[PDB]
Symmetry: C3
Subunit: 148 residues, 3 copies
Amino acid sequence: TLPAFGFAFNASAPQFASLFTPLLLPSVSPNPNITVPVINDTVSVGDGIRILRAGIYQISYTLTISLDNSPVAPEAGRFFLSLGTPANIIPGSGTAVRSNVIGTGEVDVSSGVILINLNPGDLIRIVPVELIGTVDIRAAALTVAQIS
Amino acid sequence: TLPAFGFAFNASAPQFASLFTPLLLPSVSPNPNITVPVINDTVSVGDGIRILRAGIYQISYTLTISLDNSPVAPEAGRFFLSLGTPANIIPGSGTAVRSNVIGTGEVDVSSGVILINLNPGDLIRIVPVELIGTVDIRAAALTVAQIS
Amino acid sequence: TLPAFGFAFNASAPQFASLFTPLLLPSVSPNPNITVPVINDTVSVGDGIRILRAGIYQISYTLTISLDNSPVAPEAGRFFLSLGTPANIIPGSGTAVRSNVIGTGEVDVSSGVILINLNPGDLIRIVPVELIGTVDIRAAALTVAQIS
Ligand SMILES: [Ca+2]
Ligand SMILES: [Ca+2]
Ligand SMILES: [Ca+2]
């Protein structure tokens, strides 16, 4: 049987990060020639991916983060993957960024990869858990791929 | 059947990013003890990987990017994976970096992971699509692994 | 047969980077609901993962790096995965970060993904190979997943 997988992303709609608020991931169709959902036995719900098949999964997320130092300097965010409710964070999935206190204009990329046992009904989302300032998420992506 | 895969990288030759110009990836042999091509039913062409087998693929890329703020400040780059011609970018694969307008010396890492349906003949490359300044790509890497 | 895999991380104990000294990765159990080792035919040794099964592996690492510019500015680190002894670095796995020479407070994420042929007894670890200053590794993670 082909492994379960899913890919959800936001390529064209920046969003500001809010505490314990899952990032929006409206798209599932990355190939520009044969443009179809890259989904097999998972469900993209609009802010993440729901597992339908118990198994071991490799999960990645990638964020492009603009910390322009307005209206406060520095700006910072700490992000995790969450299982179910947004506060139910996954240790091992955390990443964090912070700008310099001087100047303006920094844009950074955070990406993380984990492996995790998951079960039917588990909802995987990207959640900001600590924020300073207005943290602009220019793009976001979430990959889920069963190891089998 | 073993999944198709390929790994192409540039570990020892920095290159400046140019618009719509695929990054050079001359090496395929990462193990320092048993130093062999990590290639199975793909082809490394020198600036990316060509697919030979239809399937679902997890693709990653990793870049170490020096934005020294010379000759302009800030410096910035936006990168995507491309399918076929360099302008045929893959939504969901984008990353971007930008230095502070003040000071000098920033070096950043961008990494992205996607899942994508691909077909025989598809050529996957890393492409800069927007640039400010002289963006020094100190190291680059591209992984392609079929999910099957 | 299910692919070999392992996940080792450090979520709750920052460590400063030292030359040729593998980063500490004490945890293997990321799911907060069903909290179990995500290990199959590998061994987590406390500073990395030992391979038990010959095969092709996708390996990732993710670091959250604080470069506060004290006691020197800038601060910088270059990291690789190592095979066996810490100086036996894997070309293609390198990443590097450096702060601005001005100001303070930068926190960056580095993540890298490779594919590699590996053999029983191979020990995979994350190693700093060049350092400037006191480079604070706030969190670290290492994924190993056989492609089969
Ligand atoms: Ca802001
Ligand atoms: Ca420059
Ligand atoms: Ca320091």
